[PDB]
Design an enzyme around this catalytic site. Structure first.
Site, PDB file in Angstrom:
ATOM      1  N   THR A 261      28.675 -58.137  23.189  1.00  0.00           N
ATOM      2  CA  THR A 261      28.382 -57.432  21.950  1.00  0.00           C
ATOM      3  C   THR A 261      29.178 -58.026  20.801  1.00  0.00           C
ATOM      4  OG1 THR A 261      28.016 -55.382  23.195  1.00  0.00           O
ATOM      5  CG2 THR A 261      28.281 -55.193  20.815  1.00  0.00           C
ATOM      6  N   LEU A 262      28.477 -58.667  19.869  1.00  0.00           N
ATOM      7  CA  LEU A 262      29.131 -59.242  18.705  1.00  0.00           C
ATOM      8  C   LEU A 262      29.369 -58.223  17.603  1.00  0.00           C
ATOM      9  CD1 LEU A 262      27.063 -62.536  18.537  1.00  0.00           C
ATOM     10  CD2 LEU A 262      29.249 -62.154  19.678  1.00  0.00           C
TER      11      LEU A 262
ATOM     12  N   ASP B 240      27.184 -49.934  24.220  1.00  0.00           N
ATOM     13  CA  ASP B 240      28.507 -49.925  24.830  1.00  0.00           C
ATOM     14  C   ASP B 240      28.874 -48.534  25.321  1.00  0.00           C
ATOM     15  OD1 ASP B 240      28.718 -52.630  24.239  1.00  0.00           O
ATOM     16  OD2 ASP B 240      29.716 -52.267  22.331  1.00  0.00           O
TER      17      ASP B 240
END
Lengths: 256, 124
Positions: free
Chosen positions: A1-2, A59
């Site tokens: 996850t950026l 997330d």
């Protein structure tokens, strides 16, 4: 996850005479686009523990699955109710997860609240655990749980973690936190706790663009973990100067 | 000297004769305007007459167009008497003054302030 794409806004958890009250609006935004309006942002880990999140939904779901399997393993190994993991244990687990991901620079874009009851002396709910049937949904009085037996904990993206009598994430960390540091008191009743939380949520709805007034309340008490019926918060403006027509102001100048 | 009456310089007695001559030029137009003030109202009455000048009043002249009364803004009005070109020039100056005041100050100039600004321009 950026980075965050689909996100949830603030969560508010507080202690009151019968346990934990945690509230969050059921909205997930894909930027400025309120794509999802009936999203669940509070999860039950076990009969005494809940998890709320603000940040990336993906997330949050990853962490929720991790905690679900941790609880299943705990239940598999359990022989007595004292063997069930506590909110403090789950808070430590989540803090360690976040710390390791910080060290790897692969963080979860989330702020997490782990709340619940840190004791087994108020009920026998963990003597026989039911995962797929909720007997709660036959009404006995709630038990006055000591404040020291309750637990609310916060974990952030950098692994910073702590606990308090009330925890907030997101913009609640400004609006609701100010209101709570002013007005929170020990051993509040359920109605008083709900009124305080409703004031905080109303201010959030008025001053936060990523929030809604469709609210989910969850109570962790001696009865276990209860999800309330989601409700629309009534939010009316607090001034008639807002409603005053613009054509009734002087036509010259920057009256807007 | 030889130009104390040609220029706006003082004459030995301390007069500025060009101003008196301009006042005489205004007086020679033979246009009369009367302004009156009431309790909550003000009225200006004027003649729909052509200021006397080199040209005269023709039969085919449109007499509705003849006017010495103008709007400076929606709420401020005036009557100007004198040489017609000068009157038009003054009306445009007053309109630009009022618009600049409105833009700069966020509210509409009042008649006293407009008149004082016009006179400050005339002093130059």
């Amino acid at each position: 996850t950026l980075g965050p794409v689909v996100t949830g806004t603030s969560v508010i958890a507080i202690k009151y005479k019968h346990g934990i009250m945690i509230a969050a609006d059921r909205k997930a935004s894909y930027g400025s686009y309120a794509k999802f309006q009936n999203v669940e942002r509070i999860f039950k880990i076990n009969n005494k523990t809940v998890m709320g999140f603000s940040g990336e939904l993906a997330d949050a779901q990853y962490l929720h699955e991790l905690l679900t399997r941790k609880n299943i393993n705990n239940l598999s190994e359990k022989k007595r109710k004292e063997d069930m993991y506590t909110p403090q244990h789950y808070h430590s687990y989540v803090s360690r997860v976040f710390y390791v991901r910080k060290n790897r620079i692969d963080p979860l874009f989330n702020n997490i609240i782990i709340a619940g009851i840190n004791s087994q002396k108020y009920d026998n709910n963990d003597d026989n655990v039911l995962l797929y049937t909720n007997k709660n949904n036959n009404n006995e009085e709630y038990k006055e749980i000591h404040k020291d037996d309750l637990y609310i904990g916060f974990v952030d993206m950098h692994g910073t973690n702590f606990c308090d009598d009330y925890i907030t994430t997101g913009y609640a960390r400004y609006f609701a936190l100010t209101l709570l540091r002013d007005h929170y008191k020990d051993n509040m009743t359920e109605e008083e706790a709900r009124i305080l939380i409703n004031e905080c949520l109303r201010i959030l709805y008025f001053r936060d663009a990523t929030s809604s007034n469709f609210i989910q309340i969850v109570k962790v008490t001696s009865k276990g973990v209860e999800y309330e019926e989601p409700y629309i918060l009534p939010c009316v403006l607090n001034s008639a100067d807002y409603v005053y027509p613009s054509t009734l102001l002087p036509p010259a100048g920057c009256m807007w | 000297s030889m130009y104390d009456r040609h220029l706006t310089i003082f004459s030995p007695d301390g007069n500025l004769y060009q101003i008196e001559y301009a006042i005489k030029a205004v007086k020679n137009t033979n246009i009369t305007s009367v302004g009156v003030k009431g309790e909550n109202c003000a009225v200006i009455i004027s003649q729909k007459k052509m200021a006397t000048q080199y040209i005269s009043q023709d039969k085919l002249l449109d007499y509705n167009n003849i006017t010495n009364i103008y709007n400076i803004t929606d709420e401020i009005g005036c009557s100007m008497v004198g040489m017609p070109g000068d009157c038009l020039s003054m009306v445009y100056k007053a309109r630009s003054e009022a618009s600049e005041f409105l833009y700069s100050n966020g509210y509409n100039v009042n008649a006293e302030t407009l008149c004082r600004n016009i006179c400050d321009k005339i002093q130059v």
